[PDB]
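Feature request disguised as a bug: please show the residue count (262) next to Poly(ethylene terephthalate) hydrolase in the output. Example input:
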Amino acid sequence: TNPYARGPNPTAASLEASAGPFTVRSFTVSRPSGYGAGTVYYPTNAGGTVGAIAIVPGYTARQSSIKWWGPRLASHGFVVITIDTNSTLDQPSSRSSQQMAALRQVASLNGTSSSPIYGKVDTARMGVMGWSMGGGGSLISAANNPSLKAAAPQAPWDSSTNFSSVTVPTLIFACENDSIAPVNSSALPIYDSMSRNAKQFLEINGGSHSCANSGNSNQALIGKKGVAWMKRFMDNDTRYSTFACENPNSTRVSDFRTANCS
Ligand SMILES: [Cl-]
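Example output, currently without the count:
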């Protein structure tokens, strides 16, 4: 019945592991269009077309800070593009237009017969992630493009916290002890402003600003949650409803909140 379903039935163990069931390859985008540089990750054998997720780093940062998501998400059946921005000093709106430019270019490559992702993408099924200003950028993309199927920003930064217009299912990773984008004035008012969506707030206990980046010590839970959220909302895959909406009931989590998520 569900045509966007990919992969075998999830367990806690299969989502806590570093790799999911599909084989991953990557390539560097040859002529990046509307953004500085891109790396694309893709499953060779997903058994059908999959959605595309475009991930953006923070101010002064690079792909390295958010790369781990590439292998992790692609292995469970997604096309992931991680980007560098035109300038290290771009603010969240510019990060947004470049995030959407990356999705636009993944859609183009899906149509190009010489491209390693020829025919692998469902260009009607995309989502957005990013760290800090790239997180703020992810929220701006979702507000501007309600056709996105999912957002999952981490440690988000935006001097405007009102996202009340967002209808896209949104998972916010927060970092308890963030002193760059403190939760009390960033993540939390952002979460709290959204009244029209499936949403979730998941605060990493004793986490600093970088608590969700490559090399974090909570990859099991952060990665499980990130994959379950994209599987639930980008694939409509109700096999993942429990993993996506449940409280982890974990001492690794200092604050949990969810709404409109069964
Ligand atoms: Cl930032």
